[PDB]
């Protein structure tokens, strides 16, 4: 047909393609092949002049689908996406004088979650800046597809820069971006335990940028392995110091192996016993009376704490709960911890 | 082969079990001309760290050895001075020994020997030896940092030289072991004196170096306020790491008046979301305290008035996102009215929206 050949001929191409647009209201692979063989972020992202580039030739298709009979013309762009995958995220770019991104769902249903993931991976590989400036709206318009698994989170953190991580934490702290949910955050961090160094630091900073209380994720302490997981251990230590210790947190801290090169437990216990002395004493007393966390593990962690607390002026082993618990407990492993029991005896 | 002299040193050369053979030389270099030691140390230098399992029964395997005996013979030292010339010439020939001594000092008594060795040119000696150690063996530098910072606080807390040295090569696991050492009372790398200047200097380092510096600072117990003036120096595009860490740590603070002064005293850029983020956080958890501080700042107790007003208008335009009665607090409305009364007519229509919150009902 000769109008489509006129569009081929010109290459102010908007009305020229509106010719085809008007004609596709009653064998499209050749049209989409022509369109594909025919064919992102402005350097200064200024509002309403970033849409200066959003016009142009191909994006006009998007426009004609943003206006019932709203269904008999997305087949063309479905064939475009089946030919050229990149347009899949270009649409997202266009959608962010459009209405709302509720069009993209309708576009996805011709291949939502796997479409979003592939388009976002292509965007990540090609243009990182576009992925940054697209992440908030993506996570907002599609929460039940993006908050469930660290796929998209890993995608972002694998390529993100420190300045891009700063703009992302800002977006989180401003009410514009939400990347975790109290449901999935634990699963997602246990998954994150396998990522690169800076990827894991980015994940943890982004989690702190939300307002999810530490306890929701303190079970992760089970999974934190001395040799294997430095970043999550460091962030969890530096955040746990700032918390009033619950009994479950001190159980989780004591339920980690005693390795002579592992300084997490004794560090956090020293901090707690110096600022929350009687509360920590109460919790470890309640733990000592039979609440693996074998008794000798608690005793060894406490003996490490005792041998360390001589560094400072700390009457923590004078607390009445701890001496009460020590004498109650003492009544095989005995010769191992004589000193400890001796603080509650002599 | 090597311009030579005395036969005890020649037996040590012949073997190359060398410990007593070398203490022979040690004892011989007591009643000696101080002219012929450069060739002895040249022989010793042309002659020539951490055990894989660092057990205080296999690190003392390495503290033995032939050269360390010199150190040993000086750790029983009046006549406590007349034998540092030999190792001074060793250091002038082979610099590495400078930190080996430190290693030796970490079944020795106390490290007050190292100063006596340094006086052969303490601070620049420490810095050169620690830089050489950083260059050669990072693992030794890590396992030596605590004692270095402890035995010489006034030499290592003075400038970020040593901190930069460590963070430039450190690993994430070694950064975790260092944060642990800090949190255990064994290592202190900042002090309320220098910490502010030291971080302002750190603002020029690489990404991961700055991340390490900030993590290590949080591992200490220096309150944020002591370093909150650094917000003046933090520039939006250029300093992401310090801004992000400062944001996530300011999140955990009940806002002081100086902290809100420092947050309000940074420029308003439409891509800079630091101030409005932290203000949103504060006004959502401690709304009326933040309002009290902004009232005391607005009645003037640099921060120009329009800067505060623009930051507050950004906060207002953002707070429509959520349910936040922060602009219903009485301190903030009282302050708004006080400001509006003595306000340039320009800023009246400039912030009409803002002032109307304290005017209309």
Author numbering:
A (entry chain B): 576 to 586, 593 to 607, 612 to 624, 634 to 661, 667 to 695, 700 to 714, 719 to 898, 917 to 956, ...
B (entry chain A): 571 to 586, 593 to 624, 634 to 662, 667 to 695, 700 to 714, 719 to 898, 917 to 976
What text comes from the article?
A complex composed of Integrator subunit 3 (Ints3), single-stranded DNA-binding protein 1 (SSB1), and SSB-interacting protein 1 (SSBIP1) is required for efficient homologous recombination-dependent repair of double-strand breaks (DSBs) and ataxia-telangiectasia mutated (ATM)-dependent signaling pathways. Ints3 has an N-terminal and a C-terminal domain connected by a linker region. Ints3 also binds 30-mer random ssDNA and does not bind dsRNA, dsDNA, or DNA/RNA hybrid. Both nucleic acid binding and Ints6 binding properties were attributed to the Ints3 C-terminal domain. Here, we present the crystal structure of the Ints3 C-terminal domain, uncovering a HEAT-repeat superhelical fold.
Finally, in situ proteolysis was used to screen crystals, by adding a trace amount of trypsin in the protein sample (1:1000 w/w). The structure of the human Ints3 C-terminal domain reveals an elongated, HEAT-repeat-like, all α-helical structure. Each repeat is composed of an antiparallel α-helical pair or zigzag, referred to as a- and b-helices. Owing to twists between neighboring repeats, the a- and b-helices form a right-handed α-solenoid. Two copies of the molecule are found in the crystallographic asymmetric unit. Analysis by PISA suggested that a 1702.3 Å2 dimeric surface might be stable and present in solution. Because of the twofold rotational symmetry, helix 6b from molecule A stretches out slightly and sits on top of helices 8b/9b from molecule B, and vice versa. Of these, each of two hydrophobic residues, M780/M781 of helix 6b, sticks into a cavity on the surface of the other molecule. Electrostatic surface analysis of the C-terminal domain dimer revealed an extended groove with a strong positively charged potential.
